[PDB]
Enzyme design. Structure first.
Site: not given
Ligand SMILES: [Zn+2]
Ligand SMILES: [Zn+2]
Ligand SMILES: *[C@@H]1O[C@H](CO)[C@@H](O[C@@H]2O[C@H](CO)[C@@H](O[C@@H]3O[C@H](CO[C@H]4O[C@H](CO)[C@@H](O)[C@H](O)[C@@H]4O)[C@@H](O)[C@H](O[C@H]4O[C@H](CO)[C@@H](O)[C@H](O)[C@@H]4O)[C@@H]3O)[C@H](O)[C@H]2NC(C)=O)[C@H](O)[C@H]1NC(C)=O
Ligand SMILES: *[C@@H]1O[C@H](CO[C@@H]2O[C@@H](C)[C@@H](O)[C@@H](O)[C@@H]2O)[C@@H](O[C@@H]2O[C@H](CO)[C@@H](O)[C@H](O)[C@H]2NC(C)=O)[C@H](O)[C@H]1NC(C)=O
Ligand SMILES: *[C@@H]1O[C@H](CO)[C@@H](O)[C@H](O)[C@H]1NC(C)=O
Ligand SMILES: *[C@@H]1O[C@H](CO)[C@@H](O)[C@H](O)[C@H]1NC(C)=O
Ligand SMILES: *[C@@H]1O[C@H](CO)[C@@H](O)[C@H](O)[C@H]1NC(C)=O
Ligand SMILES: *[C@@H]1O[C@H](CO)[C@@H](O)[C@H](O)[C@H]1NC(C)=O
Ligand SMILES: [Ca+2]
Length: 804
Positions: A231, A265, A145, A312-313, A107, A269, A422
């Site tokens: 997580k 990710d 996400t 995903d991004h 991610d 962030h 994102h």
């Molecule tokens: Zn994501």
């Molecule tokens: Zn994110």
């Protein structure tokens, strides 16, 4: 000294579970707390055995107890390590009949991370060097996400599968959706068919270590195996319980599999995409992959598992210094806002005022207020059609397009402003994700161009030998990645053949309202719309060199052959469905002469007096009379068969496109083939619709008002070659889907000087050729001497400008 690492009680460095004394002693233990806290085993342990508490096993009865360390066989016993191994060059074990598939998501891994830091990620780099990798892979809007993950496993756009954002509200359910807990597992939100159910229905086992929706019972079932999301679960332990799955008996061995981690990710962030911490998490991520690649090596399937590595991004850097506040545009901020890089605005009082809430006034107050705002407000139907973000009740009408690195938020108490995020446009570089692929059926040492993520679903089904559910991806367009393409694409059939629009006389009396004072012999000038069979042949290959669009929509059209252009005129809309002409570099000329077409039935034609005074609409020209040499040639375009009703403010941009932009593109590109036409999409589903659907017309007429105008520009990537002599594989395409509006408020210029706002405006409105086809029911490039999977490559392509 082996007894018993971090032990009690039983020379030096075997003791103790200190109970620290100044010397424990160091030497033989440090390479030990390892088996319990590391997923790798050392030398100082190689050949050792199980210990009461451990993560990974080294050693000695492990190859068949199904538990030891990925690097064990090379860092304990010594065989080529995957990483330190060349890229060569060979199948699964027999307990493996068909090639497995692993879908591995990291991610927030943007395409740029790869190009820049490839040397810092040895295992991803080996994989790219010898797998099949893409320059980048696009996300779907908004780049979040869940939108993109579930898109990846369904092949669907956000608006179709329904997870259109992290947070959404559905008025028909009167319900809320949040990634921040229940009820997100309510199946009512998730449309479509995830890949794991496609495997379950058609007879295969699918196991997911974490994927959005895997924990959800979509359509009344789960993935055969799944995992409650945590997580804090160590990445490595995921790789371990993932590899354990393939050690399983061949009857319950899972065939499809997912792997997912939250980096880079999380760190992207917190600290932003260009940061040292981000690089650290990238290494973490590369390790997570190395292990997997090794367990592929430890077993004998490394050259058998098909593996897709993607994200995903992307990730974009943000700041508290770059924020737009609704308080700047609203004396009263009274409404609900989804805040961020992909904002939305709805009513606070729902359900009651959901529809009643005036989304257009909210857009109109956010429009052109400061000379340079860092965002733009749209009604969803007015968003660029490339985004396919309209047709869902969850997609609120008010939408903001935020500039990259900026954010649009409600008030000044806004706090999550630092680091990265994102959600921006999927055309932004920062938002592109990675795509890498290793395995049989994937070529090795191949890179491919960028493709969209909505293709991946088909690909997975093609690798798994399945039949995919209906989706947005175009089956076969990814066959350039595949050693043995599973699915061969089939040309769609024309469902509406041409009809004839034959020659006839000048009507007596002529009631069209048309006047052209300049023509001397009329029946002579009209005779040029009646070509001999070989003038028609020359024009047929000069202006339709790639083939005539097939018409898959049920429509009543006919073919109008001229020397400089060709068009299919449909009596259903009183205008042409499509119009094609070639301009060859190189290459004041408008309507003052206009006349009806003797080949069209009057009842089925627009008239010069249909466009009466007191109008915001004028006839526009599909084939520009700008582009023909006077005099007799210009007459061939000055007919009522070449006109479309255009809003005058749109006509402004359109004319600037003929007069200045198109010639420049043509000489810059050595001529162009231009096929343009209208689009009616009043249900804003991204498709063509029954003609009973058009809801707007030219006043006091039946002439339909197009919602969009499309322009496909075709030339050769080799500027040495023209559109006419370009080999199919090298063809260049720039397609436009332009919104047909009464004003230019979107350019924030209902004012001078046509300069730099037109090009920017069109620039954000490019589309794939496929998008045009779906909106018009037309099939392009029918006559191309090429494997059609290639032609699918050309039609999934989306032109993106560098702000150019
Ligand atoms: Zn994501
Ligand atoms: Zn994110
Ligand atoms: C991206 O990919 C998806 C998959 O192809 C496309 O989504 C499909 O869109 C088409 C056309 O818009 C849909 O076809 C329609 O099906 C309706 C019934 O569907 C039932 O089942 C679906 C399951 O998803 C439910 O959502 C729905 O509520 C229904 O229970 C029909 O009623 C429609 O019929 C119309 O047919 C013709 C018009 O062509 C008319 O004569 C009729 O009067 C009637 O109005 C229509 O057949 C299809 O259901 C969608 N599939 C899914 C899975 O949602 C997207 O279009 C595509 N995106 C783009 C832009 O291409
Ligand atoms: C189609 O016409 C409508 C309305 O036209 C008005 O009323 C007619 C009977 C005639 O008297 C015309 O001269 C009038 O303009 C248009 O709707 C108007 O649009 C204008 C500007 O766009 C706006 O100021 C008015 O408020 C609207 N309604 C009115 C005039 O009461 C509409 O724009 C026309 N559409 C096209 C495509 O020409
Ligand atoms: C052994 O592991 C325990 C935790 O279970 C830890 O407290 C201890 O420090 C470890 N022993 C040594 C000396 O590494
Ligand atoms: C959706 O969430 C927000 C609560 O933060 C609220 O404005 C809205 O009323 C909620 N929807 C409902 C009806 O639960
Ligand atoms: C839902 O499952 C049913 C059978 O249980 C199946 O017929 C249908 O195709 C599935 N729908 C989707 C969207 O997967
Ligand atoms: C998350 O995983 C960690 C690591 O094993 C565990 O300690 C914790 O209990 C888990 N949390 C939940 C909510 O299960
Ligand atoms: Ca439509």
């Amino acid at each position: 000294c082996r007894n018993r690492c971090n032990e009690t009680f039983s020379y030096c460095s075997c003791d103790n579970k200190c109970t620290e004394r100044k010397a424990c002693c160091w030497d033989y233990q440090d390479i030990c707390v390892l088996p319990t806290q590391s997923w790798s085993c050392n030398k100082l342990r190689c050949g050792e055995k199980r210990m009461a508490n451990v993560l990974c096993s080294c050693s000695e009865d492990c190859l068949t107890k199904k538990d030891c360390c990925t690097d064990y066989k090379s860092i304990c016993k010594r065989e080529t390590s995957w990483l330190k191994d060349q890229c060569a060059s060979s199948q699964c074990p027999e307990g493996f009949d068909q090639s497995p598939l692993i879908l591995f998501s990291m991610d927030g891994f943007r395409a740029e991370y790869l190009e820049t830091w490839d040397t810092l990620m040895p295992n991803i780099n080996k994989l790219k060097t010898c797998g099949t990798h893409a320059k980048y892979m696009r996300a779907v809007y908004p780049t979040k996400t869940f939108v993109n993950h579930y898109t990846i496993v369904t092949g669907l756009y956000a608006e179709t599968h329904g997870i259109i954002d992290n947070n959404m509200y559905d008025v028909k359910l009167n319900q809320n959706f949040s990634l921040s807990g229940s009820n997100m597992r309510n199946a009512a939100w998730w449309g479509g068919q995830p890949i794991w159910h496609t495997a379950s229905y058609q007879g295969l086992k699918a196991a997911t270590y974490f994927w959005p929706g895997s924990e959800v019972k979509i359509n009344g079932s789960y993935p055969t195996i799944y995992k409650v999301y945590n997580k804090s679960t160590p990445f490595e332990a995921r790789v371990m319980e993932v590899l354990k799955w393939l050690d399983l008996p061949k009857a319950k061995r899972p065939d499809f599999s997912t792997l997912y981690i939250e980096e880079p990710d999380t760190t992207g962030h917190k600290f932003g995409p260009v940061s040292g911490q981000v690089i650290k998490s990238l290494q973490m991520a590369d390790r997570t992959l190395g292990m997997l690649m090794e367990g592929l090596k430890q077993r004998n399937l490394h050259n058998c598992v098909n593996l897709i590595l993607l994200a995903d991004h992307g990730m974009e850097a943000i700041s508290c210094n770059r924020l737009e506040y609704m308080t700047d545009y609203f004396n009263t901020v009274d409404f609900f806002m989804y805040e961020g890089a992909a904002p939305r605005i709805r009513s606070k009082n729902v359900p009651k005022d959901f529809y009643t809430f005036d989304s257009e006034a909210i857009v109109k107050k956010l429009t052109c207020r400061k000379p340079k705002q860092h965002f733009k407000a749209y009604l969803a139907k007015d968003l660029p059609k490339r985004l396919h973000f309209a047709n869902n009740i969850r997609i609120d009408k008010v939408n903001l397009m935020v500039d990259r690195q900026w954010l649009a938020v409600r008030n000044k108490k806004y706090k999550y402003c630092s680091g990265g995020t994102h959600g921006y446009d999927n055309e932004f570089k920062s938002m592109e994700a990675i795509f890498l692929a290793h395995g049989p059926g994937f070529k090795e040492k191949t890179e491919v161009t960028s493709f969209e993520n909505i293709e991946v679903y088909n690909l997975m089904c093609d690798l798994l030998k399945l039949k995919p559910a209906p989706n947005n991806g175009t089956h076969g367009s990814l066959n350039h990645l595949l050693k043995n393409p599973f699915y061969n694409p089939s040309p769609a059939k024309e469902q509406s053949p041409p009809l004839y629009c034959l020659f006839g006389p000048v009507p007596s009396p002529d009631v069209s309202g048309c006047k052209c004072s300049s023509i001397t012999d009329l029946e002579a000038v009209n005779q040029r719309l009646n070509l001999i069979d070989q003038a028609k042949m020359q024009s047929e290959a000069d202006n339709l060199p790639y083939g005539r669009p097939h018409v898959l929509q049920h429509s009543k059209y006919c073919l109008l052959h001229q020397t400089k252009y060709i068009s299919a005129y449909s009596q259903d809309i009183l205008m042409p469905l499509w119009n094609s002409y070639t301009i060859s570099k190189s290459l004041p000329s408008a309507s003052d002469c206009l006349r009806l077409d003797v080949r069209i039935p009057t009842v089925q034609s627009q008239t010069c007096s249909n466009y009466q005074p007191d109008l915001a609409i004028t006839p526009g020209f599909l084939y520009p009379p700008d582009f023909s040499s006077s005099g007799p040639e210009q007459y061939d375009a000055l007919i009522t068969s070449n006109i479309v009703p255009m809003y005058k403010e749109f006509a402004r941009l359109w004319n600037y496109f003929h007069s200045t932009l198109l010639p420049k593109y043509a000489t810059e590109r050595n001529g162009l083939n231009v096929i343009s036409g209208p689009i009616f999409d009043y249900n804003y589903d991204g498709h063509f619709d029954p003609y009973d659907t058009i809801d707007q017309y030219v006043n006091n007429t039946k002439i339909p008002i197009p919602t969009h105008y499309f322009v496909v520009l075709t030339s050769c990537e080799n500027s040495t070659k023209t559109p006419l002599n370009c080999p199919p594989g090298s063809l260049k395409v720039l397609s436009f889907i332009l919104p047909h509006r009464p004003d230019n408020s979107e350019s924030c210029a209902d004012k001078s000087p046509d300069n730099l706002w037109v090009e920017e405006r069109m620039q954000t409105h490019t589309a794939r050729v496929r998008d045009v086809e779906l909106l018009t029911g037309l099939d392009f490039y029918s006559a191309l001497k090429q494997p059609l999977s290639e032609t699918l490559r050309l039609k999934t392509f989306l032109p993106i400008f560098i702000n150019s």
